[model samples]
Target: NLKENIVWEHVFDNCSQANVVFSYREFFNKELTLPDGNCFFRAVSTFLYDTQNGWIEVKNMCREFAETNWDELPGVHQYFQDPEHYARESKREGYWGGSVEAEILSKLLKLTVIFWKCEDDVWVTQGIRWGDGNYLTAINLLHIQFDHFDFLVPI
Candidate 1:
């Protein structure tokens, strides 16, 4: 219990020192997901449905969305050679996902996705917020230095 409390305090301190703009007393708690290369999908799946079981569905759907809307999702080309390459590579198990997948997932899932990162001086928030007014929201907290994704629990 004491060790867990120490780690909890460490998380709070990391966010605080990075200047995350939460409410005065708000805490940003994270629920960790698998560290497999497909952690981004697992994180999003866990955030959306409170379980990781939907990761493959989320990944396949997002990959399909990217493939179908290749011209529209010009952002993907930066990471992938093309949508065909993306589809081929993404179908593999443990494929590492990034902002391209995030944007695609946002469109497929219709939720605003926020990426949280810590710089040497401050925290950085970045992601896609495209959706109609009634869409859901979520944060994909990123360990930038290590390239891992975890979900920040909504308070």
Candidate 2:
């Protein structure tokens, strides 16, 4: 019943429905050799969401990288610490915005939006059905799953 309810919520929300459908079609129809190609924009959007939500601690880490001494920060740590430098490198290599990485990030963002809306609906429904203690647990677990997507990647 909960799964059905979630499906109904997805239908009602229509969250990223168009793009998702398009991607699936492209994959199955063999119209696109790489399904990942169609997902670039959404992936980039996901990274933006991560940056916005403090996932991967991008905001603080980037700030520290930007403000601190590069040599003292330790090897490879600068990338996480300084977003500006990362952005600059990305620009130089043509791998930041509008790049494959960006596309993947956008895809992630799209997924996040879908999950967020679905979880919200589930929680609201559960609130109304509070007579069942299990409903609360279910909502909590859903929230945890949603939180997993709050981060950019790699747990």
Candidate 3:
């Protein structure tokens, strides 16, 4: 199930065992990104460049990739309603991102991005990878709970 709902089903795994488990590509050195709409981009920047200062540029790259490859990214439509709206709003300063944007970033940056969400004391994980070729050995790990994204050190 490549679609959103089915993916969520896999990601939201029930971990009644209650271990501090961050699955699918674990990492450490958790760092905070401000709770702004650009948290995803900021987290990506922090992990990639060792600073969040590149967030704006990273966000724009994602937006450009999304716009240029809009026809291919059906999954993104689930979040933005339509490509037109996404193209417009994605360029905005405070538009938060999700797995859809993470996928776009993965393709744009040629890397893997792993995001986790905690629900009911369980850590749910998802991994977004570049569609083709080998991405770098390092992985980008992020903790996103609904809105914010926090950077995690490479595993």
Candidate 4:
């Protein structure tokens, strides 16, 4: 059996459009506390895009995209409720903003591949870019890392 705290009276209390803003701030504040090394990158990626927890997930995805694929990914307006569209745009524009390529690269480079499933509607992963001319190297390295991690985890 699963147990959860129930706040019956305040179910709808303290909920408003502004709660989104507060939630976003709370999430970002957490992201900012990540370490400067690869851990930071991983933390940011996980906190933003990987979860499906509504506003927090959206905020994280946006931040991850901006941090990794700022040049290649589409604007925030274009990314509304359709990350697949943004993915296509990234390919079409050859911009490479925080898409699969980035995610794969980062993992290949021995960095963490943070992922979260916020809900049926929202699933996100971290992008790959880390340093200059690192994508190819990261890709090559990721093959080995994937084998290692995959062996430990079933999928």
Candidate achieving the largest TM-score: 1
In order, the Cα lDDT scores of the candidates are 0.58, 0.26, 0.58, 0.28
- Relative to the unseen true structure, what is the C-alpha lDDT of residue 40 in candidate 1, on a scale of 0 to 100? 81
For every candidate structure, what is the RMSD over all alpha carbons to the true structure, in angstroms?
9.8, 15.7, 7.3, 17.6
How does candidate 1 score on lDDT? 0.58
For model 4, where is the 10-residue window of minimal lDDT? 146-155
For candidate 2, lDDT tens digit of each residue in 62-145? Answer: 334434434433323423455466545533432322221211222222222222212332222221111122221211111112
CA deviation > 4 Å runs, candidate 1: 1-27, 118-136, 142-144
Superposition TM-score, candidate 2 onto the true structure: 0.21
How does model 4 fare in lDDT?
Answer: 0.28
TM-score of each: 0.67, 0.21, 0.64, 0.19
Stretches of candidate 3 off by over 4 Å are: 1-27, 80-84, 119-138, 144-146
lDDT of 4 by residue, 72-126 (tens): 4332333433555544554342232233433423433444332221221222122
Q: Clashing pairs in model 1?
A: none
Ranking by TM-score: 1, 3, 2, 4
Of candidates 4 and 3, the better by TM-score: 3
**Per lDDT, what order, best first?**
3, 1, 4, 2
Among residues 3 or more apart in sequence or in different chains, the pairs in candidate 3 whose N, CA or C atoms overlap within 3 Å are none
For model 2, the superposed segments whose C-alpha errors exceed 4 Å read 1-23, 26-79, 96-155
